[PDB]
Amino acid sequence: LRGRKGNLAICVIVLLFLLAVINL
Amino acid sequence: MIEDSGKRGNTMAERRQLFAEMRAQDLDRIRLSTYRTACKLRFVQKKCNLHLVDIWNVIEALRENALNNLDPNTELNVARLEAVLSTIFYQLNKRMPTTHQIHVEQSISLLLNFLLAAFDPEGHGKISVFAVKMALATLCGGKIMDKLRYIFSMISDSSGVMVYGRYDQFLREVLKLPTAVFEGPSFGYTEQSARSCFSQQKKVTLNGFLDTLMSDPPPQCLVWLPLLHRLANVENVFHPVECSYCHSESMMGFRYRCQQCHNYQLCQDCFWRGHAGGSHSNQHQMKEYTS
Amino acid sequence: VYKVGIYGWRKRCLYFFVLLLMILILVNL
Amino acid sequence: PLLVALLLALLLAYIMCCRREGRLKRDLATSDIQMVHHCTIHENTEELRQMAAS
Amino acid sequence: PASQHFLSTSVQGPWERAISPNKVPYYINHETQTTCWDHPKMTELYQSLADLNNVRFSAYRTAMKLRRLQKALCLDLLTLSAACDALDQHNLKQNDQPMDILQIINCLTTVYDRLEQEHNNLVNVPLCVDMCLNWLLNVYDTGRTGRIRVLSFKTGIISLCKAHLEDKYRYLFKQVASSTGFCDQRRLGLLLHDSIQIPRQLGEVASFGGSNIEPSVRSCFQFANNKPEIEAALFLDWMRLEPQSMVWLPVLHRVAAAETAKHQAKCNICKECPIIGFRYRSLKHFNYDICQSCFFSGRVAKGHKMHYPMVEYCTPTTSGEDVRDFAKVLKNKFR
């Protein structure tokens, strides 16, 4: 589903965000 | 026979009502004969809703009624001709929206009564094709250029040169229209109108025809011909300027400005009815603004 | 007779997140 | 990084300033007769499914 | 019939409803010597049509109304092959052969039996036969003589069937051309006359040059380099030139195709996203896309220009093509 693909993309965004936070 | 008498009485009553409405519009109080004739023609066109019909609708309708390949001087017999008006009526109805539609009988019966007044003063019931065709070509809405090109096409030969006899008959037919609106003494047919408009020696082309009839000023016997069209264009123009005679906050229609006095402006009603005041004099020149 | 639906506030918040991560990571670099 | 942050602020300005766009004002300029058309042109457009059913 | 006095008041004025020996009612336009039918189902169909006078342009109006009719008549379910087999089965090959009511009834039964066998839940044979007879005799039986031509019926069915546009063009050309494939002025004029009998039935004949077929033949034979006869390829090329009196059929094909189109775009007036149907993109400004719902009403956003060019997408777009035309419009606005 487009909604489910978007939700997994949001999970990708969140994991990238936390990775960048711990890098900082 | 009895139903024919009833229909004749109804048509006469409708014509009388139309003339009473025209006289009740106070257009006869207009001092200028040209503007009075133009206003009467505009009121007749608006009441008959003929401003919504262009020359092309008339051309297609006469093509449908097999009038394109007929002699111009063919007297039309008295008949119902219900499909004849139905052609134009349905052509308009298919193009116009439901809310933007007009009456069925009043729209055309008044036009027929006015045509009878203009071309059949003796009640003969026989009108030539040329007279009605020229009346429909002139009184229809749209652009004056297209109707004038059509007229020049039908008053000329196959070589594009206007025929003096055909042009003379055209002038005869179109100068009966001022007689229909009681402007005979104002704009009546004269033996020297064709000579004044055009010379019998110089050949007039389509370009020459357009330049001569739209010259500045136009010829006296047809000066009301373009002006009425202009009266159709300026009839809904808003001017946020005050007046000087009636002191109107907003004036709609033609604008007239005096080039002599200071801060003096007049509306179309004040100008056409001869209204004047102050140190201004009536002989002063007026410049016409259409916007 | 007006019926249109597209998630708009979600788009603004996504653009906000992209903006802040861009700021943060360019600062880190 | 100051130039970078300035460019990011320039981005955010039109990211948030637009706030989508209105449609009711375009209805206001639209004539109510044209709005009557808007129903009818949508009525047969939404009847496309009932075109298949019929 | 008893319904005569009841439904004679549905129309007024010169229109005069009359009954036929085949018990199908019809109006009369007596001074034009033209007559049209109106069945109660077609009466309510035309009443629904009369509220759809909102189309600003001419060709769009004709195409949309004809598509509505074809879907309502369920004749869009008919293919070229079935109609061709049905007409060849009844030996209706001579274009000038007089056609009585019985032969048309038999051919219509032949078509609609197959149509019902394919569309049992969508086609009712007697009602569809009555409706299609109503329409065909509306177009080509204005004299109430009960006799029509095979060529006119063929043209109507082939135009109103489901087939490729060039396939219908080729079949109609073969119908009007001789055994050598050549078509002179007279056969082209007859075909154009049969074509122009259709818009006059609805009332949009004058917008395409009227009923005068002579300018159309003149243009076709001027494109033919004044050749005495024209060929199928030249006929196709002149048709793709989009003449005034025949553009309505490709506009119908386009609207039929775009009825199922779905564009990922937003209407720049009514803010409708995604665009479903016809998408219109301005070729002067940027990011201006309008749906046909507001386009047909004549309402314009930001006003029109000195020239306001428009492209009309009827199919979902290709990203390469729209990036190319976006580059073109940036180039245009740069100058």
TrEMBL record, chain C:
Subcellular location as annotated: Cell membrane, Sarcolemma; Cytoplasm, Cytoskeleton
Transmembrane segments: 13-29
Protein family according to the UniProt entry: Belongs to the sarcoglycan beta/delta/gamma/zeta family.
Protein name: Sarcoglycan delta
Gene field: SGCD
Residues of the full protein shown: 56 to 84 of 324
